Amino acid sequence: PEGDTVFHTAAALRAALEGKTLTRCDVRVPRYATVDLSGAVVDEVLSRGKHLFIRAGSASIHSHLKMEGAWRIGHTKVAPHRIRIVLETADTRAIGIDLGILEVLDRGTDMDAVAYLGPDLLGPDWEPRVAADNLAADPDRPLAQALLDQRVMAGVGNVYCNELCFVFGRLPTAPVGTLKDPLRVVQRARDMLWLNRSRWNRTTTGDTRNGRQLWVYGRAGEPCRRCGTLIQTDRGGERVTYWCPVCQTA
Ligand SMILES: [Zn+2]
């Protein structure tokens, strides 16, 4: 999950839970087995970068999504991974599966958990100059590592990292110092995530149709949509990269 998925999940949970009294709060995490927020209203569901917070009563349920489809809404219980939490209201059910962190924090201090985050690409008070100065603060830093650092700005994961590198004509190992305009980079990242904040069908090309949605990610061996050259890929290091060797040069 990247920042768009997490924001969208927060929105889906808001539709299911926000403003409603919890009828069930079953936290299947050992330290939190005794938490039972039933009888409290879910006052707010919000995202902070790749983090989710569910505020109810005096508590804030903090989760960090490692798996797409991590929170599921509806009454179907069959799932590919372990159910870690069930929340219900009179009319709705939300289940959290394969969550990374799932913890119950004090509501009043819940933002201390994530106060170090850089500007949130999908947060209400986004600040592109802060993100741009953070991104450019160390010009010898490799571009992809800087984009993926949640203290620089919050929300880019491997898909958006690959896509941003393509639209700016840079290899992921290019130093940030080679960017003509770091402000433009972070503004385009904001625009890309914003366009997908309510779209699970992640699209960066402007064309949402099947097979048309991304420039390079997941497209090894397919033609670049601009120059026609076949897309290349490398699976060394942490993350898989995809790039057009004509549009993205050293
Ligand atoms: Zn190309």
Residue numbers in the entry: 2 to 251
Paper lines:
The lhr–nei2 gene operon of Mycobacterium tuberculosis and its avirulent relative Mycobacterium smegmatis encodes a pair of enzymes implicated in DNA repair: the Lhr helicase and the Nei2 AP lyase (1–4).
Here, we crystalized Nei2 and determined its structure at 1.45 Å resolution. The refined Nei2 model (Rwork/Rfree = 16.7/20.5) comprised a continuous polypeptide from Pro2 to Ala251. A strong anomalous difference peak was detected overlying the modeled zinc atom. Weaker anomalous peaks were detected over the Sγ atoms of Cys225, Cys228, Cys245, and Cys248 that bind the zinc ion. The N and C lobes are arranged in a saddle-like shape with a deep groove between them, in which the N-terminal proline (Pro2) is located, thereby demarcating the AP lyase active site. The saddle groove is lined by positive electrostatic potential that provides a docking site for the DNA substrate, as seen in structures of AP lyase-related enzymes.
